[PDB]
């Protein structure tokens, strides 16, 4: 039977080797992990989501455990750190019994019993919270706390929740519809702002270009309008041959800006109707002030994320060629103004015909701060979306794990009895999350646990670690919470993963 011992030993070794790493990852007092991949690139990463993708993985079975943890990550966003480590201690508690001589199928049956005996506790430990703004604010605060410094989480927990209040269509929630995230290197970090509209990449270049255009329709284009010294040899291989050739290109822009004048004499016979133009490529240096003498905002260097949000939110009908300069190919933008801050210009399009697409504009002094706060923002809005579609929101910070372990050890030998060791091996491996949460913040792993392992009411009390003191703290009145499906799919997937790994003997 040493054959099965070989596979059991190598799987135990791999799932310890991941368990220690992802134990160090978890927690708001956790440490970042820096990943270098060949070209000397530096990525400061705390979340296990990017860590399980980009890791040049040492071990064969660890690749499978990382792939299935990513398959769990597809629905939860975070908690996957806790997912793969609760696996790596679940089969550790199994290894405590297969070394005693038990069959692995006994421990799989115990996991199967304890899965239902934990989910029956999970369905009643929750509370069907109404979707008040503050009951989402504290969820955003908890999901933002484990990523960045906690005061920055208290800053951006207002900018997350109103962006999530801007989604209110009860047919389908998706974050990739409307939340666009851009960055401003203002050498400041606390001013990540939600703007109810499309924030563009840049702004009005000319000084005589108008700072303020209220009732704006938009001329979109993609192809060139600049005085284009072409990227092939513009001086082509006398002098008169090109004296009017690129000047014929100039005239091709002269009658074009005459056509632009014609289009703004189609609708803009009144001056209250202002206008903005955007080309995705460059603006001609004489058309720059030629529209600045007309007072129409012009801009280059647009991204396609800006174009698709001009079409979807601003109602902009897209344009490719200049033959169709017609009033139906416009949009609607009741607030267009450039906003130069730091060193770069930035136009803001808002008050569009259907305000749906928003912008969580990130202020950041360095690149790693803004990427960490971007992952913080995205995981927070994902967690609060998972708190939206779940009608209930469970307490957090390890309270439900202690209460579930206090449920499962009170689950008697009503179970098979031979499979009682499976229940007792499932229960103690639930306590590792309040173990390593208090452990990651300098407190005692054992003393804080046994302080929480004294149920502070007649019930197994919803009491988690405090990440600043290491004291038994009720997570209800502090609102340190999380949604339901994170730990639900956590327990389900981790049970099926453990019963998958526990039944392997020989590999070739």
């Amino acid at each position: 039977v040493a054959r099965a011992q070989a596979a059991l030993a190598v799987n135990i070794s791999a799932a310890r080797g991941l368990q220690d790493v992802l134990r160090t990852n978890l927690g708001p007092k956790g440490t970042m992990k820096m990943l270098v991949s060949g070209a000397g690139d530096i990525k400061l990463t705390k979340d296990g989501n990017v860590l399980l993708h980009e890791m040049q993985i040492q071990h064969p079975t660890a690749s499978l455990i990382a792939k299935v943890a990513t398959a769990q990550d597809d629905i939860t966003g975070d908690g996957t750190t806790s997912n793969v480590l609760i696996i790596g201690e679940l089969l550790k508690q199994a290894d405590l019994y297969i070394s005693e001589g038990l069959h692995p199928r006994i421990i799989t049956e115990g996991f199967e019993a304890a899965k239902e005996k934990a989910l029956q506790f999970l369905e009643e430990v929750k509370v069907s919270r109404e979707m008040d703004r503050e009951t989402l604010i504290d969820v955003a605060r908890t999901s933002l706390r484990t990523k960045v410094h906690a005061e920055l989480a208290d800053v951006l927990t207002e900018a997350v929740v109103d962006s999530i209040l801007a989604i209110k269509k009860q047919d389908e929630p998706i974050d990739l519809f409307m939340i666009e995230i851009m960055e401003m290197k203002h050498k400041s970090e606390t001013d990540t702002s939600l703007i109810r509209g499309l924030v563009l990449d840049h702004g009005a270049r000319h000084p005589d270009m108008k700072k303020r255009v209220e009732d704006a329709y938009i001329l979109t284009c993609n192809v060139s309008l600049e005085y284009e010294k072409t990227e092939v040899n513009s001086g082509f291989f006398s002098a008169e041959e090109r004296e009017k050739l690129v000047k014929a290109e100039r005239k091709f822009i002269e009658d074009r800006v005459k056509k632009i004048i014609e289009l703004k004499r189609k609708v803009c016979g009144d001056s209250d109707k202002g206008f903005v133009v955007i080309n995705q490529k460059g603006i001609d240096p004489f058309s720059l002030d030629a529209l600045s003498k007309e007072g129409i905002v012009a801009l280059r260097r647009a991204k396609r994320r800006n174009m698709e949000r001009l079409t979807l939110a601003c109602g902009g009908v897209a344009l490719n060629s200049f033959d169709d300069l017609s009033p139906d190919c416009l949009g609607h933008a009741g607030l267009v103004y450039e906003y130069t801050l730091g060193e770069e210009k930035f136009t803001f399009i808002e008050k569009c015909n259907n305000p749906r697409s928003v912008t969580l504009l990130i202020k950041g002094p360095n690149k790693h701060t803004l990427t960490q706060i971007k992952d913080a923002v995205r995981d927070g809005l994902r967690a609060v979306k998972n708190a939206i579609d779940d009608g209930c929101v469970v307490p957090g910070a390890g309270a439900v794990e202690v209460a579930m372990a206090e449920a499962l050890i009170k689950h008697k030998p009503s179970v098979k009895g031979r499979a009682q060791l499976g229940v007792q091996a499932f229960a103690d491996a639930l306590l590792i999350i309040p173990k390593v949460l208090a452990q990651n913040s300098g407190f005692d792993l054992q003393e804080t646990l046994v302080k929480i392992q004294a149920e502070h009411s007649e019930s197994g009390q919803l009491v988690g670690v405090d990440l600043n003191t290491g004291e038994p703290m009720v997570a209800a009145e502090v609102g340190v919470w999380d949604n339901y499906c994170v730990k639900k799919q956590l327990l389900h997937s981790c049970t099926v993963i453990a019963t998958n790994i526990l039944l392997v003997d020989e590999i070739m």
């Binding site: 440490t31 820096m34 270098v36 001086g235 006398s238 002098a239 090109r242």
Partner: protein, 483 residues
């Protein structure tokens, strides 16, 4: 973890010796076999093969420090190495890796508000040439030799004081035309874009000129090919000379019939441009780059005002000046025997004028040379015993790291560091802020830094103690990469 901060310690140690006005210069024989005997930390950091990834955060923080004041790089490296060196003592005491982070953050936030409370700022303006020449003394005093700064502060200032106008400034306009030959005393000042030329047919008092633009430089059947090439280069220099150019430029060498053509139409045959002025001459006269001799027009043309020959620096050179600013460009001419000191003189010039740029927007000047550092080292260590808890350790390990900065100023000057640190810390208790470390005395003697005039920018220290602490914190919060 300990290997990361050990890499940070050796990264601090390789630049600690090059700190201050007596920095020991290092030799760079690089990948493409240069030869630099240099002292600036950003030059060595851009040459060193920084292979360990944890030190790359320190290098990037020093690069961000360079990107906004231009100086204070070695200060960031020394202070970050000191913070990590005391952080490993804090860890081996038994403190967590979390506690040192917020301890360093609290003490850095305390330093950020104590630092504006020791300032002896600038007097009235960045004009009044002889006043701000003394203000620019400390920057090149740190970099180049001190006995050389007395001419060099004037030469670096009288050119940069041309346009301290209307609340805006650019450092790119201050250039160097590096001309070899005579000594450093023979260096002089020029007003406009200057480089050497070859020929002589220059129209001098031009109007708003018409400048040629180059992005790329240069029996009877044989005689017929000769006449064909003859009228070929004639039509070429006419293709520049049509639309009325006053100069004809080239990055390369002369041609005999072409120079006779440039004398026939009376055009200045400009020669020998560098591989860097091809953008810079285009920037100053409004010129657009043209490859060959055939495709200029009047629209494809630059516009200087006065192009003639100058003989300052004992050599014939060109002058481009009186642009839209009418005094935008103002190069300097730096004269040396060899090149291996001239790169250090050049890298002292721009590191003086960026301090002039930060003096345009920050007139606050702190006493430098141990004065500010020992003051912060006393203030934060007096704050350290006030707040109890574990942070009482870390704050007290913060200010002690400040004492590593004059120690690096001490041991680079042949001075016993413990004696001069104890003496400076004692005299700072009563003989307050403006005293610091004297350089010239072999005896560990202190000296007041205000009357010595050795003062630094306040914003440079303010950004440097932010970036070094951010680098130390973001290094301390990693564990490893599989490597």
């Amino acid at each position: 973890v300990y290997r990361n901060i050990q890499a940070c310690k050796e990264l601090a140690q390789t630049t600690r010796t090059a700190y201050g006005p007596n920095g020991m210069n290092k030799m760079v024989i690089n990948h493409l076999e240069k030869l630099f005997v240099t002292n600036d930390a950003a030059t060595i950091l851009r040459e060193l093969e920084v292979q360990h990834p944890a030190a790359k955060m320190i290098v990037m923080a020093s690069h961000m420090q360079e990107q906004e004041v231009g100086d204070g790089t070695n200060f960031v490296l020394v202070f970050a190495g000191a913070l990590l060196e005391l952080a490993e003592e804090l860890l081996r005491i038994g403190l967590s890796v979390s506690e040192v982070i917020e301890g360093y953050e609290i003490a850095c936030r305390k330093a950020h508000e104590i630092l504006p409370n020791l300032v002896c700022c600038s007097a009235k303006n960045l004009r009044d040439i002889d006043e701000v020449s003394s203000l620019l003394r400390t920057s090149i005093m740190s970099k180049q030799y001190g006995n050389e700064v007395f001419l060099a502060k004037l030469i670096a200032q009288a050119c940069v004081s041309i346009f301290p106008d209307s609340g805006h400034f650019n450092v790119d306009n201050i250039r160097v035309c590096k001309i070899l030959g005579s000594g450093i005393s023979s260096s002089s000042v020029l007003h406009g874009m200057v480089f050497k030329k070859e020929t002589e047919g220059d129209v001098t008092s031009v109007k708003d000129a018409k400048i040629a633009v180059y992005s790329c430089p240069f029996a009877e059947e044989l005689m017929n090919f000769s006449k064909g090439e003859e009228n070929l280069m004639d039509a070429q220099v006419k293709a520049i000379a049509d639309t009325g150019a006053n100069v004809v430029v080239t990055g390369g060498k002369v041609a005999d019939m072409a120079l006779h053509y440039a004398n026939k139409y009376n055009i200045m045959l400009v020669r020998l441009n560098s591989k860097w002025d091809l953008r810079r001459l285009c920037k100053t006269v409004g010129a657009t780059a043209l490859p060959r001799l055939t495709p200029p027009v009047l629209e494809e043309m630059g516009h200087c005002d006065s192009v003639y020959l100058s003989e300052v620096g004992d050599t014939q050179v060109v002058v481009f000046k009186h642009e839209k600013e009418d005094g935008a460009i103002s190069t300097i001419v730096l004269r040396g025997s060899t090149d291996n000191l001239m790169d250090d003189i050049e890298r002292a010039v721009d590191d003086g004028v960026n301090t002039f740029k930060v003096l345009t927007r920050d007139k606050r000047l702190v006493p430098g040379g141990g004065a500010t550092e020992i003051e912060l080292a006393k203030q934060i260590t007096s704050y350290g015993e006030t707040c109890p808890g574990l942070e009482q350790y870390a704050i007290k390990k913060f200010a002690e790291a400040f004492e590593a900065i004059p120690r690096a100023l001490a041991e680079n000057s042949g001075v016993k560091a413990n004696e001069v640190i104890s003496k400076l810390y004692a005299v700072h208790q009563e003989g307050n802020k403006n005293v610091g470390l004297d350089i010239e005395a072999e005896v560990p003697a202190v000296k007041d830094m205000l009357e010595a005039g050795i003062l630094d920018t306040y914003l440079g220290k303010y950004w440097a103690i932010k970036l070094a602490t951010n680098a130390a914190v973001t290094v301390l919060r990693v564990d490893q990469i599989i490597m």
